[PDB]
């Protein structure tokens, strides 16, 4: 599913993302549209192997088993392709593990690169939420 941004948006505002570990709703939309351009089903094969999955492009390396990378961890227990799923209920609790991890949203690199300290409000703008 690609969402629309304003879709998006309200969907992770739903499940609880809006300031989870302080971190706005503009914050999460914005690394959304850079990894994944709101499209549920983006992949990317990673260098060390690994494989990133979903609207927010999550690493199996550490955090869901797709069979296929080596020395990894499930740590939110699912297999990789449930986070393409076009419910992004397993791509938001799976986030909010990876978030807490102790860089904050720092362990997306396209939201370091591409998000912080940018008007991240604006990935809002004009939704009804
Ligand atoms: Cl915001
Ligand atoms: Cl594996
Ligand atoms: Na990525
Ligand atoms: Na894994």
Not at 9 to 23: E, F, I, V
Not at 64 to 89: F, K, M, Y
Not at 94 to 115: E, L, Q, Y
């Amino acid at each position: 599913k690609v969402f629309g941004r304003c879709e998006l948006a309200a969907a992770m505002k739903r499940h609880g993302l809006d300031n989870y570990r302080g971190y706005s709703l503009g914050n999460w939309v914005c690394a959304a549209k850079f990894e994944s351009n709101f499209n549920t089903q983006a992949t990317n094969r990673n260098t060390d192997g690994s494989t990133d999955y979903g609207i927010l492009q999550i690493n199996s390396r550490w955090w869901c088993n797709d069979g296929r990378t080596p020395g990894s961890r499930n740590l939110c227990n699912i297999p990789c392709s449930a986070l393409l799923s076009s419910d992004i209920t397993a791509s938001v609790n799976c986030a909010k593990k990876i978030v807490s991890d102790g860089n904050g949203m720092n362990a997306w690199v396209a939201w370091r690169n591409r998000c912080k300290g940018t008007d991240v409000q604006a990935w809002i703008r004009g939704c009804r939420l």
